[PDB]
Amino acid sequence: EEDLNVLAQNLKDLYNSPAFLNFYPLGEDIDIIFNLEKTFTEPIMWKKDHRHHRVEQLTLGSLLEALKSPCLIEGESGKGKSTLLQRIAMLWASGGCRALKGFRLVFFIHLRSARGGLFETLYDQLLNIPDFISKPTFKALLLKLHKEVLFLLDGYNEFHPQNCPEIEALIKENHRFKNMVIVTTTTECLRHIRHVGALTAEVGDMTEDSAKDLIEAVLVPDQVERLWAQIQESRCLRNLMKTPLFVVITCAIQMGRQEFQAHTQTMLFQTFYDLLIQKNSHRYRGGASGDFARSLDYCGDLALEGVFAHKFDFEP
Amino acid sequence: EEDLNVLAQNLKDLYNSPAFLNFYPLGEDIDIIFNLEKTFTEPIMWKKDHRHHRVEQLTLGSLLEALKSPCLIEGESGKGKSTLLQRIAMLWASGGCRALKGFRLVFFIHLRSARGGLFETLYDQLLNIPDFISKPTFKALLLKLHKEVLFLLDGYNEFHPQNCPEIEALIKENHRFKNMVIVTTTTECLRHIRHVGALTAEVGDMTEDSAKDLIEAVLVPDQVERLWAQIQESRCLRNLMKTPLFVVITCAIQMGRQEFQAHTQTMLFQTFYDLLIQKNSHRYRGGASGDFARSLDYCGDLALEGVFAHKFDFEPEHGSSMNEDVLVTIGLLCKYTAQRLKPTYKFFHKSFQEYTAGRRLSSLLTSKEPEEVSKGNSYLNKMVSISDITSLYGNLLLYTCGSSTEATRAVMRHLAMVYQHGSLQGLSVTKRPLWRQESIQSLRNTTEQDVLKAINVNSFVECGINLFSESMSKSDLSQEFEAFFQGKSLYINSENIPDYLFDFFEYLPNCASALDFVKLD
Amino acid sequence: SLSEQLRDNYTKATFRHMNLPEVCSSLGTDHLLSCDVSIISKHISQPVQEALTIPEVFSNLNSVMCVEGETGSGKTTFLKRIAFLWASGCCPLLYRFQLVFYLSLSSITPDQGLANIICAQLLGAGGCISEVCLSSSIQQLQHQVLFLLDDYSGLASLPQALHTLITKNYLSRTCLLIAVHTNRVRDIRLYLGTSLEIQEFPFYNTVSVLRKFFSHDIICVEKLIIYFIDNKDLQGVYKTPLFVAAVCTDWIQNASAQDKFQDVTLFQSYMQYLSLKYKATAEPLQATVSSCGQLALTGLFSSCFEFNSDDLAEAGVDEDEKLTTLLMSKFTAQRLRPVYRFLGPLFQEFLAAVRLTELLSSDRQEDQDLGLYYLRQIDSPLKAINSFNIFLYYVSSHSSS
């Protein structure tokens, strides 16, 4: 047990790292503030069903209280729910909940960059495994504990199973593991996993009071007050407060020294549009087969043919 | 422990070496005095934050009292903060602080020249490691002690991770080490490290009293006294005292035997400019891909397009920032990959950019191409209002005329003709020695704006005589300057008269023969 | 026992010999039979600290130290002085200094340490004790080891234990000395605590040497001392005390000065020694003579003495020939463009006199138009008495006509 006591001790105390607690909320290109102490609010969730029904409005702790491995969590595009998952592992390193306290093994990996075998891929981001803890000791330990084992798996939008078939086996064939696993992804390839796992829940919108907490959290009260006065004029912008990413951009442009109030809302959509062009320039390699501006023309033609003919569902 | 007692004993006593205590403060080319006993002063610092806010003005000891590994320290260009770090390790070898006394392992490496493995790279500059202390004993000792371990890491501006991936792992993956590490760099590649480390602080400016300690420390009191008299005249030079490197150059030129007082301030900017050309000739290999003078032309065109269009922040588009990052890699201006969407590029001093447009302007007046000289006359054509020349273009044409004799004549051709006043209601007098404002003064002329025209013309003549004084073309263009101040007046307060007036009547008294009057206080 | 062998070897009696009586070869030493100079001890952050003496060197010894002077002259006389008088033991700290090491690195760069040069220019360095075990005998008894290192100016990083000892001077807690000229003090400056300058005191040194070595003739010594106050700048030309051997041959080997004692015979004989010493053909030894002669033409041209190092169109290349010849040198600390210095500022005018007879009795294309050119730049008769007295009396030698 001394192997688990020392290694699991340094992993219980390892997960308060500033790189583990901070990242760039618009990807990797721009120096942008993140803080699990500050930027994290409480988002709304919905317990799903076979009818895809929003049954129970799950919070974070209520999702912890309703544990069903494999825990399938899905949401919207460009969310960055590693805020949520690193909040879970960070409060596990800080004593967050009693149900969190009952765990012993908590992991977290970027599936967008995971490669090599499972012992090696977890060795790719921990690097503190001596020869004295072998790979049959590793995997036979994981299957050996069998109840206090917990994985946080994120980034299936860019997961590739040839990088590690063992992780994909941990997703699908849980019966050969029977360890507590949590998978977080979008609806891009949700159809590939959904039928296997038991728990299914979505991340809903963001409330205006939690958005008030986020705006008041990270900026001087002058920009918060007058920018908030722009929020409490446009009802359309109050519809736009149902996602955190717009709130990040509004706390990004007005961040500085002055009331940049020329950004009424059209420059906000231009900044969001071209900013997603910036984040997804070569994240998904843009247009891999066929160039990028052609697909931009395709999206715009979907918008013209949709809106002009009054069409807002799209099933080709 | 005997390995740590003997080796750490000789490293506690090893760090008072004269090579460890002295270097060349302008790089490696010139024999220049350094002394941690003398040259070291106390610089100001600022505790940073996620908002990049100057929270707490940290000193050296207060930074030692606020230890957060990894300690991220950043500052300006060309600073040489190995003064600071070798002061830390030297006072560790001398008993500096109690928090310093609590350490056992203190290291320091040039990241600009570090190569090989960590045991080998530390063996590259210590060489006193026998076979009895093995590399697993070394690294397992470093991870073994785990709390009294301390690294001083400097020179990330020229660090290359293929020379040692273990050092870059010590930077980023501290969790596999968990030893006390200190990284010092500039803002050239600060974006690569900043998100990982916890502590962040900057080295601020330099105070005039610590600069007084530096000037009084290293030079004879005659040059200190009269050079300090040049310091306490120019307010712009007192703005230039916010960096130690100018103070090094002023304690370098006047170092010798005589009052070299011909170096007014334009030769100081020329010495700083060409001296940074000397230090960064092949330090960053100059212009590696694409030659050096092309990037010099790019910096000067940034200065002309910036200053002439009144632009002093510089955020070009992504992809077109190639020669931008070339010139920041050299060390021309400060880049900022701080909390801003597109990264910020600006000069460390505004009037220094004005010098860059000055020597760039005289440089485009220098060649025999008529397009660049007549185009420089089109840059002159951006001045038709004589008051805005005094408010904005004064230091520009001051540095331009002072930098070369050739540009002076074109300044005579253009400013000899320009006479239109321009803005006066938005340009009323802020500070003046005219402290008495009677109604009899309004009974001389009821139009106060014509008195403001006299202040515009007289301050324009102040720019003219200051221009000729800083030009130091002391006896050449006498017919032109005599043909300049004709039809121009002169206001003199008799209660504060500097010596360049004595130089004015001295060198060209025929200009005083061609004046209109002096309103004398 | 190694310390007993080397202590028995470093008290060498034939080690005394110096070519300061070169062809004169007088039966005598250069300490009991010759006077001394002093120390201009200069701090590294520019105060001129003190002017210490030779036992004052011994009081606060320097663990690594550089001195400036003249090779062949005083500096190696100071090192061989330390070793040879270290074979005497009179000062109350002597006999307890352990291991000095005399070394002149101008000959060698032999990429090998102690056994190479101790077995090469000296007797031997021991075979049962290895060369690193000899270096271990250095690095086991460090605290009283005294070094007499010479001429890093003719040295690169090629000797292994030498240059790695100098660049890692802490790793031997020893006393290191070195005698590099004022052309390359900057490479030593990274490893210095204080600088030392050799300087002649020609108040008494020249009359001590010419007193003791020429008690055979003392009436021309009366001519010398009466000449010291008729010409009160006699200290302004006596600038190196161990190149007064040209004066020694100009008394015992040239008796013409006994009835012709003024200045131009004396330093004419010094220039004739500069032809005799380093006897060679018409190389830029000779064009260093003429080319520094037109450096002297730039010297008295615009009355510029401490130069600019811009116009090296006069002399220029192969600085080892001009500093080895020693007609000039350069600045130590920082300047913007460093500054040349001379052994004697008025001696430079005698160099311009050599330039003037070179521009007076030679090829008549434009050379004598240059001597005619500056010789017409001086065309005022009231200046002629004083300036033509001193400078044209320097021209009153070299009778070619």
Curated annotation (Swiss-Prot), chain A:
Domain NACHT, chain residue ranges per copy: 69-316
Post-translational modification remark: Phosphorylation is essential for NLRC4 inflammasome function to promote caspase-1 activation and pyroptosis.
KW Nucleotide-binding (keyword) present: yes
Disrupted gene: phenotype observed: Mice show defects in inflammasome function in response to S.typhimurium (Salmonella) infection. Differences are however observed depending on the strain background: in a C57BL/6J strain background, no striking differences are observed compared to wild-type mice following Salmonella infection. While in a BALB/c strain background, mice are highly susceptible to orogastric but not intraperitoneal infection with Salmonella: enhanced lethality is preceded by impaired expression of endothelial adhesion molecules, lower neutrophil recruitment and poor intestinal pathogen clearance.
Tissue-specificity statement: Expressed by intestinal mononuclear phagocytes.
The keyword Nucleotide-binding belongs to this UniProt entry's keyword annotation: yes
GO biological process: activation of innate immune response; apoptotic process; defense response to bacterium; detection of bacterium; inflammatory response; innate immune response; positive regulation of apoptotic process; positive regulation of interleukin-1 beta production
Region feature Nucleotide-binding domain (NBD), mapped onto this chain: 1-204
TM ranges: none
Known function: Key component of inflammasomes that indirectly senses specific proteins from pathogenic bacteria and fungi and responds by assembling an inflammasome complex that promotes caspase-1 activation, cytokine production and macrophage pyroptosis. The NLRC4 inflammasome is activated as part of the innate immune response to a range of intracellular bacteria.
Domain remarks in the Swiss-Prot or TrEMBL record: In an autoinhibited form the C-terminal leucine-rich repeat (LRR) domain is positioned to sterically occlude one side of the NBD domain and consequently sequester NLRC4 in a monomeric state. An ADP-mediated interaction between the NBD and the WHD also contributes to the autoinhibition.
From Swiss-Prot, chain B:
Region (Winged-helix domain (WHD)) residue spans: 262-369
Molecular function in Gene Ontology: ATP binding; caspase binding; endopeptidase activator activity; identical protein binding; protein homodimerization activity
Region (Nucleotide-binding domain (NBD)), start-end ranges: 1-204
Post-translational modification: Phosphorylated at Ser-439 following infection of macrophages with S.typhimurium (Salmonella). Phosphorylation is essential for NLRC4 inflammasome function to promote caspase-1 activation and pyroptosis. PRKCD phosphorylates Ser-439 in vitro.
Part of the full-length chain shown: 95 to 615 of 1024
Chief localization: cytoplasm
Residues annotated as domain NACHT: 69-382
Organism: Mus musculus (Mouse)
Subunit structure: Homooligomer; homooligomerizes following activation of Naip proteins by pathogenic proteins such as S.typhimurium (Salmonella) flagellin or PrgJ. Component of the NLRC4 inflammasome, at least composed of NLRC4, caspase-1 (CASP1) and some NAIP protein (Naip, Naip2 or Naip5). Interacts with Naip5 and Naip6; following Naip5 and Naip6 engagement by Salmonella flagellin. Interacts with Naip2; following Naip2 engagement by Salmonella PrgJ. The inflammasome is a huge complex that contains multiple copies of NLRC4 and a single Naip protein chain.
Protein name, per record: NLR family CARD domain-containing protein 4
A GO BP annotation: inflammatory response
Gene null: resulting phenotype: Mice show defects in inflammasome function in response to S.typhimurium (Salmonella) infection. Differences are however observed depending on the strain background: in a C57BL/6J strain background, no striking differences are observed compared to wild-type mice following Salmonella infection. While in a BALB/c strain background, mice are highly susceptible to orogastric but not intraperitoneal infection with Salmonella: enhanced lethality is preceded by impaired expression of endothelial adhesion molecules, lower neutrophil recruitment and poor intestinal pathogen clearance.
Sites bearing Phosphoserine, chain numbering: S439
Keyword Ion transport among record annotations: no
Binding positions for ATP per the UniProt entry: T41, G78, K79, G80, K81, S82, T83, H349
Swiss-Prot record, chain C:
Residue ranges of domain NACHT in the record: 63-358
Tissue distribution of the protein: Detected in macrophages (at protein level).
Regions crossing the membrane: none
Residues annotated as binding ATP: G72, S73, G74, K75, T76, T77
Biological role stated in the UniProt entry: Sensor component of the NLRC4 inflammasome that specifically recognizes and binds flagellin from pathogenic bacteria such as Legionella or Salmonella. Association of pathogenic bacteria proteins drives in turn drive assembly and activation of the NLRC4 inflammasome, promoting caspase-1 activation, cytokine production and macrophage pyroptosis. The NLRC4 inflammasome is activated as part of the innate immune response to a range of intracellular bacteria.
Subunit organization: Component of the NLRC4 inflammasome, at least composed of NLRC4, caspase-1 (CASP1) and some NAIP protein. Flagellin binding by NAIP5 triggers assembly of the inflammasome, a huge complex that contains a single NAIP5 chain and multiple copies of NLRC4.
Protein name per the record: Baculoviral IAP repeat-containing protein 1e
Lineage, uppermost ranks: Eukaryota, Metazoa, Chordata, Craniata, Vertebrata
Gene field: Naip5
